[PDB]
């Protein structure tokens, strides 16, 4: 019943050696279930990742593409995945709902698989606005898409409200949010689309609480930071 | 006598683990005098610093806010300090005196404590224009502020004449610059504001010059790189 | 005969300490032959490298430019060399042949020594367009220069087609690229300019491969990653 899960991890910082070491680890990870793993890299590290990463269940993603030429350069380089709408961009780089929506449509048009992030802030959640905020964010994206395009879309629910707090969302809070999103998709886009849609939990987690989160009916994977424990996150989607 | 000193450290680069370990160091550091410690982060590291850093004498600062939305996201995230007009902004990104002044005024308006950086090049210094250059930079900032706003302002002198050319300024050179800045603030803004103003030294600081630098009449602390030796930089402000 | 070679290294990422240890290594290295060594980094690392680098055959470069208008201020900060037109900028940051040309000319007029990167993609090489692409890129640069400016210019042939493939161009492949560039410079700019022009091999290479590459008639050095093995790259220009 659940579609194919996705485990996706973002580079933050550190030496080329620290990255090549992770790549070696992932190349040597035997994964027995069907899962798409995604290593989202910064531009400066795409060359080394393309050079060293080779695993049948791993693809490379970009974290950003600031112009049409960048998208085209990524595709020419064999990078077919991209992460869009992450809170860092929305918070600090002026990326409104509409800007994010336009980027998703552009990337889809270019033939990217897109992991599109949505999520409400602390202030938004506490004023009881989780539903309106998150559904407004996905509505904006859907505005610029056709029904067929959804096969190229993955949604990450980023519990922006929990960033920096040291607390993972309970499986109940995560399920509620993922459920909220799927219901909107089912009703506004299509029951077929909703069933096939991957909705990833984009809060940080360890392997233990990731397993429990994955037991939730509307959780289809994770978007986390790149580190050795990403192997545990992959296994959590079994 | 001197106002409360400030010891402020800037993240440069390295892995999330490296930052984590530094946070562990600072959390366990005993500080027995009145000093405001500041850790200036890049966006990507703000989440871990908020999550892990907890010392009564430490606050978190941003290094940039490129737009109005970014200032607001920072404030909502509980980031109440910002460093503006630092050498990268002025000499790589070309922020003019006016752009810096506008940023300082906007941040103050939004409730931030601002560390505003000023400093002259070797061409400026060697051609006898240290005073006109440095004081013109601060004059641009002052134009956009009211007298009451100075309680939310901190000045940092970055001797880019030395930094950019491989020199280490002496305590005498640091003092002369700080004294120039203080006399300007005294003259233009008020002797009250001048006596209360923190002017931090932002040149090359090591374990042997830190105390002599702090003991200069017009130095009120430091703007330096984040390193384990920051503990000793803090100690030098006692 | 061959002009003075250049050995240039780009710092990728990682902690200040890791870079500082490399600077220590470089400082203790005898380099007996006539060669200009270049260490290029992002802006944040300039302070440390300026402070600590002592080797008399090394200079410090900025890893790229921001806007062409901000090159003058970066010169005044104290940077004397710059790398422009690197594939990363052309691919991801919208730097067309003409934007690269404008930056090169602006850097020269501000008194920089410039390493200007040119090279064709895998798609361009496969389609038989190595010469047209590379010569179009260098033609654009030349259009904004005068003959006297070439004394301040260095070309890096970046084998962009090989990026991410883990393979180095063969000496035959590198020589062919460098020779067609020089041939164009000789005819279009001047024989003497072409004789004095340094054309660097701008792909990562190790000591042994570098030594064989440097044997080629039109190879005048290297633009590579900043790592311990950079000492062997320098030695390979003997």
XYZ file of C-alpha atoms in Angstrom:
714
model
C 0.000 0.000 0.000
C 2.688 2.625 0.901
C 4.558 3.858 -2.169
C 8.356 3.485 -2.425
C 9.953 5.289 0.561
C 12.637 7.962 0.204
C 15.538 8.607 2.570
C 17.189 11.950 1.723
C 20.065 13.713 3.460
C 21.462 17.239 3.175
C 25.079 18.298 3.285
C 25.737 21.106 5.760
C 29.505 21.651 6.092
C 32.948 20.135 6.576
C 35.992 18.894 4.686
C 36.018 17.002 1.359
C 37.475 14.071 3.395
C 34.442 14.011 5.698
C 32.182 13.805 2.652
C 34.257 11.139 0.825
C 34.140 9.079 4.056
C 30.339 9.207 4.082
C 30.277 8.257 0.411
C 32.440 5.195 1.132
C 30.070 4.236 3.917
C 26.977 4.562 1.677
C 28.635 2.714 -1.246
C 29.213 -0.150 1.196
C 25.676 -0.178 2.626
C 23.650 -3.176 1.422
C 19.998 -2.212 1.435
C 17.515 -5.079 1.033
C 14.267 -3.174 0.524
C 12.984 -0.875 -2.152
C 13.867 2.701 -1.174
C 15.213 5.694 -3.076
C 18.172 7.266 -1.237
C 19.121 10.846 -2.076
C 22.305 12.710 -1.246
C 21.668 16.452 -1.547
C 24.920 18.228 -2.182
C 26.141 21.803 -2.380
C 27.547 22.942 -5.755
C 31.214 22.744 -4.682
C 30.834 19.084 -3.742
C 28.787 17.841 -6.740
C 31.966 16.860 -8.677
C 33.367 14.675 -5.852
C 29.929 13.099 -5.232
C 29.456 12.349 -8.929
C 32.991 10.948 -9.003
C 32.729 8.596 -5.969
C 29.073 7.788 -5.230
C 27.946 4.577 -6.901
C 25.093 2.596 -5.391
C 21.998 1.316 -7.245
C 19.653 2.931 -4.679
C 21.393 6.370 -4.436
C 20.903 9.458 -6.565
C 22.472 12.908 -6.249
C 20.435 16.083 -5.601
C 21.165 19.791 -5.725
C 20.217 22.018 -2.787
C 19.631 25.048 -5.024
C 19.342 26.331 -8.580
C 19.206 30.135 -8.669
C 18.621 30.552 -12.422
C 17.500 28.731 -15.592
C 21.119 28.099 -16.629
C 21.910 26.381 -13.298
C 18.994 23.930 -13.777
C 20.219 23.185 -17.287
C 23.828 22.750 -16.029
C 22.637 20.352 -13.317
C 20.699 18.225 -15.851
C 23.675 18.145 -18.253
C 25.779 16.953 -15.296
C 23.349 14.081 -14.642
C 21.869 15.602 -11.493
C 18.137 14.808 -11.664
C 16.921 15.641 -8.151
C 16.541 18.923 -6.304
C 15.361 20.121 -2.872
C 13.153 23.232 -2.903
C 11.335 25.352 -0.311
C 13.477 24.394 2.668
C 12.868 26.764 5.607
C 16.357 28.268 5.247
C 15.389 29.608 1.820
C 11.876 30.656 2.904
C 13.212 32.313 6.088
C 16.406 34.007 4.915
C 16.496 34.138 1.117
C 13.102 35.721 0.451
C 11.479 32.590 -0.976
C 7.734 33.153 -0.712
C 5.082 30.472 -1.440
C 4.889 31.717 -5.032
C 8.659 31.810 -5.563
C 8.914 28.248 -4.295
C 5.933 27.224 -6.477
C 7.558 28.773 -9.543
C 10.840 26.953 -8.788
C 9.049 23.587 -8.430
C 7.205 24.034 -11.758
C 10.462 25.130 -13.454
C 12.417 22.150 -12.120
C 9.652 19.711 -13.029
C 9.531 21.198 -16.543
C 13.320 20.556 -16.719
C 12.845 16.894 -15.793
C 13.821 16.997 -12.119
C 12.380 14.911 -9.350
C 11.619 17.597 -6.719
C 11.513 17.293 -2.943
C 9.352 20.327 -2.050
C 9.372 21.428 1.610
C 6.431 22.966 3.458
C 5.831 23.487 7.152
C 4.612 25.936 9.752
C 6.641 27.979 12.215
C 6.434 27.923 16.034
C 4.353 31.108 16.028
C 2.085 29.667 13.338
C 1.510 26.363 15.126
C 0.824 28.025 18.496
C -1.771 30.368 17.002
C -3.538 27.249 15.669
C -2.569 27.850 12.050
C -0.824 24.569 11.039
C -3.580 23.582 8.609
C -4.058 26.954 6.850
C -0.298 27.617 6.581
C 0.723 24.173 5.318
C -2.276 23.828 2.977
C -1.678 27.332 1.627
C 1.941 26.341 0.921
C 0.998 23.161 -0.978
C -1.875 24.969 -2.752
C 0.609 27.520 -4.078
C 2.759 24.715 -5.492
C -0.255 22.874 -6.976
C -1.371 26.123 -8.686
C 1.674 25.928 -10.966
C 1.447 22.189 -11.647
C -0.601 19.815 -13.811
C -1.976 16.531 -12.464
C 0.669 14.513 -14.402
C 3.531 16.521 -12.821
C 2.876 14.978 -9.384
C 4.793 11.802 -10.377
C 7.844 14.123 -10.225
C 6.934 15.655 -6.856
C 7.850 14.542 -3.337
C 6.627 16.556 -0.367
C 8.715 17.032 2.738
C 6.843 18.142 5.830
C 9.396 20.230 7.656
C 8.312 20.749 11.277
C 9.768 24.247 11.218
C 8.198 24.901 14.645
C 10.480 22.265 16.151
C 13.776 23.531 14.660
C 16.388 24.214 17.389
C 14.305 22.789 20.234
C 16.047 19.405 20.663
C 12.641 17.705 20.453
C 11.441 15.438 17.664
C 7.748 15.630 16.793
C 5.823 12.756 18.378
C 4.651 10.125 15.900
C 1.162 11.529 16.564
C 2.096 15.121 15.630
C 3.924 13.986 12.486
C 1.093 11.694 11.381
C -1.445 14.499 11.903
C 0.532 16.821 9.637
C 1.258 14.211 6.949
C -2.419 13.152 7.081
C -3.497 16.778 6.643
C -1.360 17.102 3.527
C -2.437 13.821 1.936
C -6.141 14.581 2.454
C -5.720 17.882 0.653
C -3.887 16.176 -2.226
C -6.492 13.375 -2.456
C -9.368 15.873 -2.611
C -7.815 18.663 -4.726
C -5.521 16.706 -7.049
C -6.746 13.120 -7.047
C -7.102 9.950 -5.028
C -4.565 8.279 -7.351
C -1.993 11.063 -6.908
C -2.436 11.052 -3.116
C -1.822 7.317 -2.910
C 1.419 7.522 -4.904
C 2.719 10.665 -3.167
C 5.737 10.407 -0.933
C 5.437 12.679 2.084
C 8.677 12.714 4.051
C 9.197 13.762 7.630
C 11.730 16.593 7.439
C 12.596 16.941 11.091
C 15.747 15.478 12.422
C 15.515 12.044 13.919
C 17.789 9.205 14.965
C 17.364 5.580 13.792
C 15.257 4.602 16.802
C 12.570 7.297 16.526
C 12.702 7.163 12.726
C 11.547 3.483 12.881
C 8.560 4.540 15.000
C 7.792 7.510 12.749
C 7.871 5.214 9.720
C 5.134 3.041 11.343
C 2.770 5.998 10.799
C 0.385 5.511 7.922
C 1.209 8.712 6.008
C 5.000 8.844 6.570
C 6.972 7.689 3.481
C 10.510 8.541 4.522
C 12.831 11.224 5.830
C 14.771 14.370 4.972
C 17.633 14.659 7.418
C 21.240 15.930 7.655
C 24.097 13.964 6.115
C 26.012 11.935 8.721
C 26.953 8.279 9.444
C 23.562 7.650 11.075
C 21.886 8.291 7.729
C 22.430 4.549 7.254
C 20.083 4.014 10.260
C 17.533 6.377 8.686
C 17.572 4.343 5.441
C 16.984 1.114 7.412
C 14.119 2.785 9.292
C 12.128 2.805 6.019
C 12.183 -1.021 5.725
C 35.208 53.142 34.257
C 34.536 50.837 31.297
C 31.103 49.546 30.323
C 30.403 45.789 30.190
C 32.949 44.133 27.876
C 31.933 42.021 24.872
C 33.718 38.937 23.569
C 32.327 37.979 20.182
C 33.427 35.079 18.037
C 32.648 34.352 14.400
C 32.111 30.916 12.904
C 34.289 30.525 9.805
C 34.067 26.918 8.556
C 34.217 23.233 9.513
C 31.928 20.298 10.243
C 28.791 20.393 12.380
C 30.680 18.108 14.856
C 33.421 20.747 15.179
C 30.837 23.386 16.123
C 29.096 20.950 18.481
C 32.376 20.305 20.346
C 33.023 24.052 20.641
C 29.531 24.502 22.093
C 30.266 21.765 24.631
C 33.436 23.673 25.604
C 31.584 26.961 26.067
C 28.682 25.377 28.003
C 31.159 24.091 30.609
C 33.290 27.260 30.759
C 33.251 29.124 34.093
C 33.056 32.895 33.647
C 33.223 34.866 36.865
C 32.990 38.443 35.609
C 30.386 40.546 33.755
C 30.944 40.061 30.035
C 28.583 39.499 27.143
C 29.778 36.612 24.993
C 28.493 36.366 21.421
C 28.678 33.504 18.929
C 28.027 34.755 15.387
C 26.797 31.932 13.128
C 25.917 31.460 9.450
C 22.273 30.492 8.751
C 22.906 26.764 8.347
C 24.389 26.481 11.840
C 21.796 28.601 13.693
C 19.598 25.540 14.445
C 22.380 23.561 16.200
C 23.650 26.638 18.078
C 20.143 27.357 19.410
C 19.644 23.655 20.182
C 22.864 23.106 22.099
C 24.313 26.403 23.359
C 23.156 27.331 26.853
C 25.358 29.582 28.922
C 23.987 32.578 30.831
C 26.729 34.827 29.385
C 26.318 33.641 25.763
C 23.976 34.916 23.028
C 23.713 33.947 19.363
C 24.247 36.401 16.504
C 23.659 36.254 12.772
C 26.368 37.380 10.301
C 23.872 38.637 7.680
C 20.254 39.505 6.920
C 19.906 40.124 3.196
C 16.306 41.319 3.325
C 13.540 42.413 5.652
C 12.042 38.912 5.799
C 15.416 37.553 6.983
C 15.621 40.001 9.930
C 12.125 39.036 10.939
C 12.837 35.268 10.656
C 15.932 35.722 12.840
C 14.029 37.659 15.517
C 11.236 35.048 15.522
C 13.916 32.350 15.892
C 15.218 34.190 18.997
C 18.387 35.545 17.349
C 18.688 38.996 18.887
C 22.198 40.001 17.815
C 23.604 40.707 14.369
C 27.039 41.634 13.015
C 26.894 44.204 10.215
C 29.390 45.893 7.921
C 32.099 43.322 8.664
C 34.969 43.084 6.152
C 33.357 40.477 3.823
C 30.266 42.706 3.449
C 32.229 45.858 2.760
C 35.159 44.578 0.643
C 33.781 41.473 -1.120
C 30.061 42.306 -1.397
C 30.587 46.040 -1.796
C 28.235 47.225 0.911
C 28.671 51.014 1.000
C 28.677 53.140 4.182
C 25.021 53.900 3.408
C 23.930 50.299 2.858
C 25.606 49.303 6.134
C 24.032 52.319 7.892
C 20.595 51.336 6.564
C 21.085 47.725 7.756
C 22.119 48.897 11.241
C 19.101 51.238 11.438
C 16.711 48.484 10.315
C 18.143 45.932 12.762
C 17.966 48.402 15.673
C 14.347 49.196 14.713
C 13.567 45.441 14.846
C 14.995 45.098 18.365
C 18.501 43.760 17.598
C 21.732 44.457 19.394
C 24.073 45.350 16.493
C 27.808 44.965 16.241
C 28.618 47.455 13.500
C 32.076 47.155 11.941
C 34.224 49.970 10.580
C 37.851 50.100 9.421
C 40.167 51.463 6.771
C 42.409 49.961 4.089
C 46.186 50.196 3.900
C 45.902 52.718 1.068
C 43.611 54.822 3.298
C 45.832 54.506 6.328
C 49.162 55.120 4.564
C 47.752 58.185 2.819
C 46.897 59.803 6.170
C 43.144 59.203 5.932
C 42.460 56.795 8.808
C 40.382 59.447 10.610
C 38.333 60.732 7.697
C 37.668 57.161 6.413
C 36.778 55.407 9.701
C 34.815 58.379 11.021
C 32.934 58.795 7.746
C 31.853 55.124 8.078
C 30.530 55.701 11.599
C 29.015 59.081 10.589
C 26.876 57.265 7.975
C 25.608 54.918 10.689
C 24.914 57.762 13.176
C 22.887 59.700 10.592
C 20.285 56.903 10.566
C 20.086 56.607 14.367
C 18.639 58.543 17.283
C 20.587 59.053 20.504
C 18.516 56.432 22.364
C 19.428 53.855 19.676
C 23.094 53.820 20.759
C 22.192 51.607 23.702
C 21.583 48.881 21.056
C 24.779 49.616 19.107
C 28.289 48.189 19.542
C 31.209 49.283 17.324
C 33.940 46.906 16.104
C 37.140 48.233 14.543
C 38.457 45.832 11.907
C 41.908 47.039 10.805
C 41.638 45.706 7.237
C 44.846 47.627 6.469
C 46.528 44.950 8.589
C 44.214 41.946 8.016
C 44.228 42.123 4.233
C 47.961 42.680 3.967
C 49.425 40.184 6.453
C 50.186 42.544 9.351
C 49.273 42.291 13.032
C 48.452 45.666 14.606
C 50.002 46.628 17.929
C 47.995 47.527 21.053
C 49.156 51.122 20.506
C 47.715 51.132 16.965
C 44.464 49.582 18.197
C 44.232 52.135 21.032
C 44.794 55.117 18.709
C 41.988 53.962 16.415
C 39.584 53.202 19.272
C 40.383 56.606 20.840
C 39.623 58.319 17.510
C 36.267 56.577 17.264
C 35.393 57.377 20.892
C 36.251 61.066 20.564
C 34.053 61.182 17.447
C 31.121 59.643 19.291
C 31.741 61.942 22.280
C 31.826 65.011 20.033
C 28.926 64.143 17.728
C 26.576 62.024 19.849
C 27.418 62.866 23.477
C 29.945 62.210 26.219
C 27.355 60.007 27.940
C 26.910 57.787 24.879
C 30.693 57.737 24.304
C 31.470 56.530 27.847
C 28.878 53.750 27.594
C 29.742 52.650 24.058
C 31.561 49.317 23.595
C 34.270 49.551 20.940
C 35.582 46.068 20.246
C 38.898 45.279 18.645
C 38.510 43.152 15.524
C 42.092 42.633 14.369
C 44.535 39.828 15.152
C 44.185 38.603 18.730
C 46.315 35.867 20.329
C 47.016 34.540 23.843
C 49.809 37.023 24.497
C 48.317 40.235 23.140
C 44.716 39.762 24.287
C 45.188 41.132 27.834
C 47.349 44.059 26.734
C 44.763 44.869 24.066
C 41.894 44.740 26.589
C 43.803 46.931 29.039
C 43.972 49.707 26.421
C 41.920 52.699 27.586
C 39.456 52.598 24.704
C 39.083 48.832 24.060
C 35.950 47.107 25.377
C 36.534 43.576 24.093
C 36.873 41.605 20.882
C 35.527 40.376 17.575
C 37.537 37.295 16.644
C 37.327 33.819 15.083
C 35.574 31.007 16.922
C 38.318 28.699 18.340
C 38.828 26.854 21.639
C 41.161 29.752 22.558
C 38.059 32.004 22.627
C 37.900 30.912 26.306
C 41.130 32.803 26.888
C 39.896 35.794 24.898
C 36.944 35.937 27.287
C 39.359 35.749 30.252
C 41.337 38.719 28.951
C 38.261 40.933 29.433
C 38.207 40.475 33.227
C 61.320 28.675 -24.141
C 58.523 28.299 -21.537
C 57.533 31.318 -19.410
C 57.491 31.083 -15.593
C 55.105 28.258 -14.576
C 52.221 28.713 -12.135
C 51.058 26.174 -9.577
C 47.658 27.261 -8.209
C 45.496 25.540 -5.617
C 41.859 26.120 -4.659
C 40.694 25.558 -1.067
C 37.457 23.620 -1.174
C 35.982 23.402 2.357
C 36.724 22.350 5.907
C 38.004 23.793 9.181
C 40.450 26.696 9.574
C 42.884 24.311 11.321
C 42.987 22.029 8.319
C 43.922 24.946 6.065
C 46.410 26.319 8.614
C 48.229 22.946 8.729
C 48.642 23.075 4.945
C 50.030 26.616 5.159
C 52.521 25.308 7.726
C 53.539 22.549 5.288
C 53.944 25.055 2.442
C 55.981 27.424 4.662
C 58.571 24.716 5.330
C 58.978 23.671 1.670
C 62.048 24.562 -0.436
C 60.956 25.555 -3.919
C 64.099 26.117 -5.883
C 62.938 26.761 -9.434
C 61.207 29.843 -10.823
C 57.475 29.277 -10.282
C 54.635 31.367 -8.958
C 52.523 29.446 -6.430
C 48.983 30.604 -5.706
C 46.662 29.674 -2.875
C 43.043 30.697 -3.626
C 40.204 30.637 -1.120
C 36.844 32.050 -0.175
C 36.959 35.416 1.556
C 36.560 34.117 5.134
C 39.959 32.352 4.960
C 41.962 35.329 3.608
C 42.653 36.674 7.116
C 44.290 33.412 8.289
C 46.246 32.824 5.072
C 47.537 36.423 4.914
C 48.490 36.159 8.591
C 50.444 32.927 8.395
C 51.747 32.246 4.886
C 55.457 33.001 4.618
C 56.647 31.212 1.470
C 58.233 33.796 -0.820
C 57.027 32.006 -3.945
C 53.366 32.023 -2.808
C 50.681 34.633 -3.271
C 47.114 34.673 -2.111
C 44.098 34.816 -4.472
C 40.392 35.255 -4.122
C 38.590 32.080 -5.364
C 36.196 34.187 -7.452
C 34.650 37.586 -7.801
C 31.307 38.898 -6.691
C 30.183 41.603 -9.050
C 32.683 43.278 -11.416
C 31.997 46.602 -9.657
C 33.293 45.173 -6.357
C 36.723 44.055 -7.634
C 38.285 47.453 -6.858
C 37.270 47.240 -3.197
C 38.604 43.656 -2.963
C 41.935 44.881 -4.322
C 41.955 47.635 -1.657
C 41.239 45.046 1.042
C 44.615 43.609 -0.042
C 43.971 40.756 -2.544
C 46.317 40.844 -5.552
C 45.337 37.711 -7.468
C 41.932 36.301 -8.439
C 40.505 33.239 -10.214
C 37.665 34.097 -12.621
C 35.404 32.075 -14.954
C 35.652 28.760 -13.121
C 33.077 26.252 -14.351
C 31.181 26.429 -11.025
C 30.471 30.141 -11.730
C 29.701 29.631 -15.375
C 27.449 26.650 -14.583
C 25.628 27.739 -11.479
C 26.022 31.465 -11.036
C 25.017 32.790 -14.466
C 28.485 33.886 -15.559
C 28.324 34.011 -19.318
C 31.385 34.504 -21.567
C 30.651 38.222 -21.539
C 30.234 38.453 -17.735
C 33.495 36.573 -17.283
C 35.123 38.988 -19.827
C 33.877 42.047 -17.943
C 35.184 40.658 -14.647
C 38.612 39.846 -16.193
C 38.964 43.335 -17.657
C 37.741 44.975 -14.408
C 40.170 42.919 -12.355
C 43.067 43.867 -14.692
C 42.141 47.582 -14.555
C 42.129 47.322 -10.729
C 45.633 45.828 -10.705
C 44.912 42.120 -10.137
C 46.822 39.255 -11.619
C 44.057 37.112 -13.100
C 43.679 33.377 -13.714
C 40.810 33.178 -16.204
C 39.247 29.761 -16.710
C 37.921 28.450 -20.035
C 36.898 24.921 -21.133
C 34.225 22.876 -22.883
C 31.582 20.565 -21.351
C 31.248 16.833 -22.051
C 28.352 17.557 -24.416
C 30.401 20.191 -26.242
C 33.440 17.886 -26.548
C 31.302 14.937 -27.727
C 29.600 17.078 -30.354
C 32.998 18.035 -31.815
C 32.953 21.613 -30.511
C 36.041 21.809 -28.263
C 37.811 24.380 -30.444
C 34.794 26.586 -31.232
C 33.680 26.687 -27.583
C 37.071 27.335 -26.024
C 38.046 29.925 -28.612
C 34.691 31.669 -28.286
C 35.305 31.922 -24.489
C 38.791 33.371 -24.905
C 37.620 35.668 -27.764
C 35.066 37.208 -25.398
C 37.780 37.874 -22.815
C 40.128 39.383 -25.421
C 37.434 41.721 -26.763
C 37.574 43.710 -23.483
C 41.390 43.658 -23.186
C 44.231 45.590 -24.788
C 47.559 44.005 -25.704
C 49.300 45.432 -22.622
C 46.731 43.736 -20.354
C 47.908 40.214 -21.253
C 50.927 40.630 -18.921
C 48.358 40.448 -16.061
C 46.376 37.506 -17.446
C 46.811 33.742 -17.076
C 44.552 31.181 -18.787
C 43.465 27.965 -17.115
C 42.144 25.338 -19.490
C 39.600 23.550 -17.368
C 38.742 20.115 -18.879
C 35.114 20.613 -17.894
C 34.101 17.475 -19.813
C 36.156 15.372 -17.341
C 34.553 16.822 -14.178
C 32.997 14.090 -12.051
C 34.511 11.302 -14.188
C 37.621 10.582 -12.080
C 39.784 10.626 -15.196
C 42.493 13.105 -16.108
C 43.039 14.290 -19.673
C 45.871 12.415 -21.375
C 48.999 14.473 -22.107
C 47.877 14.319 -25.756
C 44.391 15.646 -24.863
C 45.755 18.467 -22.653
C 48.449 19.483 -25.174
C 45.905 19.684 -27.987
C 43.673 22.033 -25.971
C 46.543 24.246 -24.769
C 48.094 24.421 -28.266
C 44.890 25.536 -29.994
C 44.418 28.231 -27.336
C 47.980 29.465 -27.830
C 47.581 29.381 -31.612
C 44.558 31.651 -31.293
C 46.405 34.027 -28.968
C 49.390 34.155 -31.316
C 47.358 35.102 -34.374
C 44.745 37.359 -32.768
C 46.767 39.131 -30.066
C 50.460 38.686 -30.886
C 53.276 36.130 -31.175
C 55.170 37.621 -28.217
C 52.001 37.704 -26.088
C 51.396 34.051 -26.948
C 54.976 33.121 -26.034
C 54.688 34.789 -22.616
C 51.159 33.502 -21.883
C 50.821 30.933 -19.120
C 48.162 28.328 -19.993
C 47.492 26.082 -16.983
C 45.942 22.621 -16.856
C 42.875 23.196 -14.689
C 41.842 19.677 -13.766
C 42.748 17.800 -10.594
C 45.856 15.696 -11.125
C 48.420 14.011 -8.868
C 52.240 14.474 -8.747
C 53.192 11.785 -11.272
C 50.516 12.690 -13.836
C 51.346 16.371 -13.363
C 55.041 15.786 -14.148
C 54.070 14.039 -17.429
C 51.567 16.797 -18.284
C 54.167 19.514 -17.658
C 56.443 17.837 -20.240
C 53.950 18.975 -22.894
C 55.063 21.935 -24.963
C 52.111 24.225 -24.150
C 51.416 23.321 -20.480
C 52.611 26.018 -18.092
C 51.352 24.664 -14.826
C 48.224 23.648 -12.982
C 45.060 24.776 -11.218
C 44.112 22.092 -8.708
C 42.637 21.445 -5.220
C 44.426 22.621 -2.105
C 45.750 19.483 -0.402
C 49.029 18.071 0.985
C 49.917 16.713 -2.442
C 50.016 20.263 -3.816
C 53.745 20.210 -2.905
C 54.220 17.496 -5.613
C 52.237 19.581 -8.119
C 54.618 22.478 -7.498
C 57.567 20.078 -7.924
C 56.000 18.852 -11.180
C 56.602 22.316 -12.684
C 60.422 21.911 -12.372
